[PDB]
Design an enzyme around this catalytic site. Structure first.
Site, PDB file in Angstrom:
ATOM      1  N   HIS A  17       0.800  -1.220   0.000  1.00 49.97           N
ATOM      2  CA  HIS A  17       0.000   0.000   0.000  1.00 49.97           C
ATOM      3  C   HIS A  17       0.841   1.282   0.000  1.00 49.97           C
ATOM      4  O   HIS A  17       0.379   2.329  -0.455  1.00 49.97           O
ATOM      5  CB  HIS A  17      -1.007   0.010   1.148  1.00 49.97           C
ATOM      6  CG  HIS A  17      -0.411   0.349   2.476  1.00 49.97           C
ATOM      7  ND1 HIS A  17       0.089  -0.607   3.331  1.00 49.97           N
ATOM      8  CD2 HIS A  17      -0.252   1.537   3.104  1.00 49.97           C
ATOM      9  CE1 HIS A  17       0.541  -0.022   4.426  1.00 49.97           C
ATOM     10  NE2 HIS A  17       0.349   1.279   4.312  1.00 49.97           N
ATOM     11  N   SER A  75       4.384   2.498   8.540  1.00 51.32           N
ATOM     12  CA  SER A  75       3.880   1.524   7.578  1.00 51.32           C
ATOM     13  C   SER A  75       4.974   1.049   6.615  1.00 51.32           C
ATOM     14  O   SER A  75       5.772   1.850   6.130  1.00 51.32           O
ATOM     15  CB  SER A  75       2.717   2.137   6.808  1.00 51.32           C
ATOM     16  OG  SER A  75       1.850   1.124   6.360  1.00 51.32           O
TER      17      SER A  75
END
Ligand code: ENS
Ligand code: CA
Ligand code: NA
Lengths: 84, 238
Positions: free
Chosen positions: B42, B185
């Site tokens: 992502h 992330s």
């Protein structure tokens, strides 16, 4: 001297000289273990092969001739915090 | 990282940082070797152009030792699914070799079965990154690490408002104010065994940061060890 176990030798307290495959003060513990226990005494990877433990290593290590330890091939092997 | 500590010299050498057009870090990564970085799928969609910095400990000061590498090949998992974040993993091949040094070193990829029995059964793992130090806070200028407990799958699923696939796992605390956060992330989740650190997760998602009854959701790297090797076997162009 009968204290010793698993047909180890008792030499007078006392001391036990074990046969191969046994250890402990009275030879009451097996050395031959599977990966489930003490990681088969491998420094890194452990996996079984015919009720037998076979150790291996990650990238940039080589398996010591003793079949258990892992020897780096340089100053920066994987998985080690950098000292310098 | 919420809570935890700053990383000391050479304590987290596998940490990479993805920087966007504006030279700004936006996702983490893990050094796998001189040519490959592991990150989250992502993250690829969160910057039009991006490079990879290694050896950075403070973003504010060009303290030297830092190094920036161009991405030659982005290898995204084709099964990555935007609505679920299933298969949230990617490998980056770099145009030029990373030079290992102080603060710059690969983490180990474990054998799958061994890591299932030996790594994923330990109490804790470590996650690191330049992320927000507070959910309402601001991205850390300094690399931080944080010890996080493994959470059993059932706990994980039931604590969650969203689908936890078998390619994910929970880690962190129930109420303690320590967790990964926005910015972390794609970053490393590693597990120690006899003083060697093995890659065991990628920072993926979570419902806020360090919220009560919530955990950090990590990509389960054991599920993708085979996929990582196939992507690394390609090596450079023909
Ligand atoms: C300051 O707020 C934050 O940092 C937020 C919020 N809110 C946050 N933290 C955060 C991001 C990444 C990893 C972790 C971990 Cl580990 C703990 N916290 C993390 N992540 C958000 C980022 C915005 C989009 C929502 N989303 C994705 C999502 O919900 N899903 C559900 C299934 C598919 C993906 C999020 O992951
Ligand atoms: Ca810097
Ligand atoms: Na929490």
């Amino acid at each position: 001297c009968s204290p010793c176990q698993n047909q180890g030798k008792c030499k007078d307290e006392y001391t036990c000289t074990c046969l191969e495959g046994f250890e402990g003060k009275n030879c009451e513990l097996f050395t031959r273990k599977l990966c489930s226990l003490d990681n088969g005494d491998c420094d890194q990877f452990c996996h079984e092969e015919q009720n037998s433990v076979v150790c291996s290593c990650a990238r940039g290590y080589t398996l010591a001739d003793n079949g258990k330890a892992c020897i780096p091939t340089g100053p920066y092997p994987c998985g080690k915090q950098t000292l310098e | 990282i919420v809570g935890g500590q700053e990383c000391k010299d050479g304590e987290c050498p596998w940490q990479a940082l993805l920087i966007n057009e504006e030279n700004e870090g936006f996702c983490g990564g893990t050094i796998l070797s001189e040519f490959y970085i592991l990150t989250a799928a992502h993250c690829l969609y969160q910057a039009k152009r991006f490079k990879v910095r290694v050896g950075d400990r403070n973003t504010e000061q060009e303290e030297g030792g830092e190094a920036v590498h161009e991405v030659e090949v982005v290898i995204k998992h084709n099964r990555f699914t935007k609505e679920t974040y299933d298969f949230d993993i990617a490998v980056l091949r770099l145009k030029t070799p990373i030079t290992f040094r102080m603060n710059v070193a690969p983490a180990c990829l474990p054998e799958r079965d061994w890591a299932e029995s030996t790594l994923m059964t330990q109490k804790t793992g470590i996650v690191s990154g330049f992320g927000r130090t507070h959910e309402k806070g601001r991205q850390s200028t300094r690399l931080k690490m944080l010890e996080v407990p493994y959470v059993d799958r059932n706990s994980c699923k039931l604590s969650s408002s969203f689908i936890i696939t078998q390619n994910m796992f929970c880690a962190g605390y129930d109420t303690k104010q320590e967790d990964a956060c926005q910015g972390d992330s794609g970053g490393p989740h590693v597990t120690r065994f006899k003083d060697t650190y093995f890659v065991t997760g990628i920072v993926s998602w979570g419902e806020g940061c360090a919220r009560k009854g919530k955990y950090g959701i990590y990509t389960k790297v054991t599920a993708f060890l085979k996929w990582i090797d196939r992507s690394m076997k390609t090596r450079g162009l023909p």
